[PDB]
Ligand binder design. Structure first.
Ligand SMILES: [Cl-]
Lengths: 307, 308
């Protein structure tokens, strides 16, 4: 009975739900040779968060917890980062969640800053230190589901056994950055549980539509990007509204609000992703003022106008 | 038409003056401050003000390019030409204080400058070179002139910053020795600020402003700096989208524990986009983590709040 609605925000007014940066563009590409199963940015149209998805954009790809010395290999540039829930409460692995909320959902070298503030003041006047660090999501000691990750720094000294928070910035490099490959949240001992399901276009001629952002790198060559299924602000909206999905597919039109011109139409699936009738890898050129409007509920077999 | 506040706990919301989750509610007298923040400003009917924009991750961020060192300007300082957050050129002639998201406090803003070169490398598959480094943007430096289209950034490196497209991701403060959250920088340098959102203060007897407070990381030094915002970023996004007409100048809001239905306290949400409570003194506000504000009715500035 509660009507379903979509926010009126433009592309530049929204945030990528897989990395804490503004959305740069809409983009579509063939993905049938990938397993498209992101864990951040997952919410059904009726407001059910899935995977590792939480509500605060600034906590996406962030970690909070404390450092407890080095790992077992004795590498003086690597540190054991014990992690909690984003709220500071202890993470409970017995819940069927893949990892603490906001944990990165891709294989790669997550680059950012680790900041510390000591538990006890020097007088208050607590000591602080921050340094650049890299959290490899493919390292054997990347075990967020078990409560810890390994962080590498360029300094082998100035990291203490103190409360710590990691603010993400981008990637260290993109040599092996695989946005559609999930990390092993429990290490080589990984049986990932509680995952949001993979998504895929079933109707002929359709591809997934993504909200794409290009992300910074510490060094190296490349223009890495990350594609989310729906913006963080849509997740916030669906979570609040909890409007029942009347069918499996909401028909949405991307409209120029000045002219009423429809740039294209798309299928917004109840699972929280979009498909369009387009073939090939290309950005979607739209006016900066445009946004999606909900039109009606249709079936999985509705034939969209080609883009 | 009907007015609503999002059902979000404070740990589910973002400070509108720095991109971090809200840690606590706090109230204190402000008679010794001019409370005129420029980020986190939105009226209840959805008018953004000051330097306020909608993307939390763009608060205290800059986008643009590096154009060499500053005049002088040592080898650790660089001229950061800034654009609008969406990449379009910033127009200084608008009655706006500075590019959207510019910091609204005196301090040493610490974070990372990232660069991706304009042209690819023929030897690397026509791919663009990248580099990132820690940097500090002092909002009191003579060359902090964002309204004029540029700020100065200081780095520990002297040799690995190019004249290339650049973005600044904020992390915290370098130190807090001269951090003054209620003192605006000179957006045009040593020239009055323009386009400002109005300053706010309590007026009804026994009332104080209520703040949403977050602690901020530091690069080094001693301290636990915090920043206070008037309303959360998620409330701003909500009011902006709804554009619901404010029926009076004050919405009466109650902070409720949803488990018990108990009202912990009540507050006045003013049309301008800020909250007052009937409390005297610099005090924390002890409330359950699951609590949130609920809109109850439209009242006036004469409404007498129950004390807390
Ligand atoms: Cl200067």
């Amino acid at each position: 009975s509660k009507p379903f609605t979509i926010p009126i925000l433009t592309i530049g007014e929204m945030t990528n739900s897989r990395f804490p940066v503004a959305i740069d563009m809409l983009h579509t590409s063939p993905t049938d040779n990938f397993i498209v199963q992101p864990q951040n940015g997952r919410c059904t149209l009726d407001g059910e968060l899935q995977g590792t998805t939480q509500l605060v954009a600034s906590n996406i790809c962030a970690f909070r917890g404390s450092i407890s010395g080095h790992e077992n290999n004795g590498d003086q540039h690597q540190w054991h980062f014990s992690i909690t829930n984003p709220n500071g409460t202890p993470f409970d692995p017995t819940e069927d969640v893949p990892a603490p909320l906001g944990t990165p959902d891709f294989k790669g070298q997550l680059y950012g800053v680790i900041s510390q503030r000591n538990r006890e003041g020097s007088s208050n006047q607590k000591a602080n230190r921050s340094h650049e660090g890299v959290i490899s999501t493919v390292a054997p000691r990347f075990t967020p589901k078990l409560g810890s990750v390994m962080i590498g720094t360029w300094t082998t000294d100035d990291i203490q056994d103190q409360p710590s928070r990691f603010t993400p910035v981008g990637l260290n490099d993109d040599d092996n950055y695989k946005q559609w490959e999930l990390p092993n949240y429990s290490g080589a001992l990984t049986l990932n549980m509680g995952l949001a399901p993979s998504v895929f276009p079933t109707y002929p001629g359709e591809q997934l539509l993504f909200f794409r952002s290009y992300i910074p790198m510490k060094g190296g060559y490349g223009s890495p990007y990350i594609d989310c299924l729906i913006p963080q602000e849509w997740i916030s909206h669906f979570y609040q509204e909890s409007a029942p999905s009347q069918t499996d597919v909401a028909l949405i039109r991307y409209v120029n609000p000045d002219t009423g011109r429809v740039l294209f139409e798309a299928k917004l699936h109840r699972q929280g992703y979009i498909t369009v009738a387009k073939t090939g890898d290309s950005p979607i050129n739209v006016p900066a003022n445009g946004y999606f409007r909900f039109d009606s509920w249709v079936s999985q077999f509705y034939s969209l106008a080609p883009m």
